[PDB]
Design a protein around this ligand. Structure first.
Ligand SMILES: O=P(O)(O)OC[C@@H](O)CO
Ligand SMILES: [Ca+2]
Ligand SMILES: [Mn+2]
Length: 381
């Protein structure tokens, strides 16, 4: 099966969970000031972006993420735990939108968009708080890769910019490396931002996707202990491409500050590039699955303490960072973010209890009975 049924799964257990977090949402909202629908949100999946400084046996001549590191110091930011290495982009993407963690599904599941999403009766995502005409997706490749076209059509999106497979195209396409530049993606985002509307962007870049090729900037060179010439060349090409994304990301956020609209960006690398051998990590193999993330608004920014979170925790962290009122569903996800996520012990009794609540909800909305359809406020603010 796609997911194990909790031992206590039943209509009454779902009822107990709905009521419990209905009241917790009320308490949380007594201190949440804003509404998520008042701000434009941008989920920016930065393909293969991860600071090589965390790879122990790697040496780079220059810091290739100086600007992004400065952004991380100014706002809520830290490390994201990835579920795969060198691939799995769409699986992280699914988790950001639904907030349903991959680690609760079965290992037999390969692509969540193909095996789980189609079986969900009414999938709830962050984009449902926005009007269909204001939901926008972007990816410089085939819209049908990993079944994205079907996902974003079923989610009521009005646009899906893609190099092929959809009516919506990118403008002024330029290549940095072999593939479409992040600059092109960023500028196409800006051209679509409508200050008169609250919008939701789901973006998946391609510039830093394998294969990596770049001869500039020449001064940036990188090597790893006992690497082959090919491995050193791929690392060098990747490090050079990161330096461009770093500068372009800074300029992108700068432009967002000049727009008269509250805008928040959830920026993250989906996984490390598949160019490092396991030896490169030495004493810290955990760094094989730790990418960079930040949650940045175009106005004033708090800095919540979340040094290590999952891709499924982003929405709950978004609501917290923007002090937005939550629904009973996101009240549960706020307890997971703070008390029962990947940074906590899986043997803690509190982590188990909160995870049991999540597993019952997660099972109910995927391949379960759908008891939550009768709890009509569980997903509403
Ligand atoms: O890194 P991967 O898993 O190949 O993702 C690529 C995908 O974004 C192409 O549409
Ligand atoms: Ca508050
Ligand atoms: Mn990827």
């Amino acid at each position: 099966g796609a997911m194990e049924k909790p031992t206590n799964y039943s209509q009454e257990t779902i009822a107990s969970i709905a009521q419990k977090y209905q009241k917790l949402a009320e308490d949380i909202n007594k201190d949440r000031k804003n509404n998520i629908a008042d701000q434009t949100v941008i989920y920016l999946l930065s393909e293969s972006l991860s600071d090589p400084d965390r790879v122990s046996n790697v040496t780079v001549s220059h810091d290739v993420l100086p600007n992004i590191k400065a952004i991380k110091n100014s706002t809520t930011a830290g490390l994201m735990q990835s579920d795969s290495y060198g691939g799995g982009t769409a699986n992280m993407e699914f988790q950001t939108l639904t907030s349903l963690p991959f680690y609760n599904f079965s290992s037999s599941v390969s692509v969540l968009y193909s095996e789980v999403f189609p079986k969900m009766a009414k999938p709830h995502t962050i984009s449902e708080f926005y009007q269909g005409k204001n939901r926008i997706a972007m990816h410089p490749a085939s819209a049908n890769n990993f079944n994205r076209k079907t996902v974003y059509s079923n989610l009521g999106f009005s646009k899906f910019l893609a190099l092929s497979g959809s009516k919506d195209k990118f403008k002024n396409i330029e290549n940095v490396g072999l593939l479409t530049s992040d600059k092109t993606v960023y500028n196409n985002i800006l051209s679509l931002i409508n200050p008169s509307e609250s919008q939701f962007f789901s973006v998946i870049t391609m510039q830093n996707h394998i294969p990596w090729s770049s001869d500039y900037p020449e001064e940036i060179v990188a090597e790893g202990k006992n690497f082959t010439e090919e491995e050193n060349h791929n690392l060098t090409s990747y490090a050079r491409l990161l330096s461009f994304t770093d500068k372009e990301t800074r300029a992108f956020l700068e432009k967002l500050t000049q727009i008269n609209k509250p805008i928040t960006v959830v920026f993250y690398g989906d996984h490390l590039p598949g160019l490092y051998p396991d030896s490169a990590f030495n004493k810290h193999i955990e760094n094989k699955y730790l990418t960079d993330y930040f949650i940045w608004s175009n106005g004033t920014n708090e800095k919540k303490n979340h040094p290590l979170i999952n891709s499924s925790d982003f929405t709950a962290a978004l609501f917290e960072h923007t002090d937005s009122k939550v629904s009973p569903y996101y009240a549960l996800l706020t307890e997971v973010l703070n008390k029962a996520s990947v940074d906590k012990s899986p043997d803690s009794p509190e982590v188990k209890a909160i995870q049991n609540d999540l597993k019952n909800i997660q099972y109910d909305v995927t391949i379960g009975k759908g008891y939550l359809l009768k709890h009509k406020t569980f997903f509403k603010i």
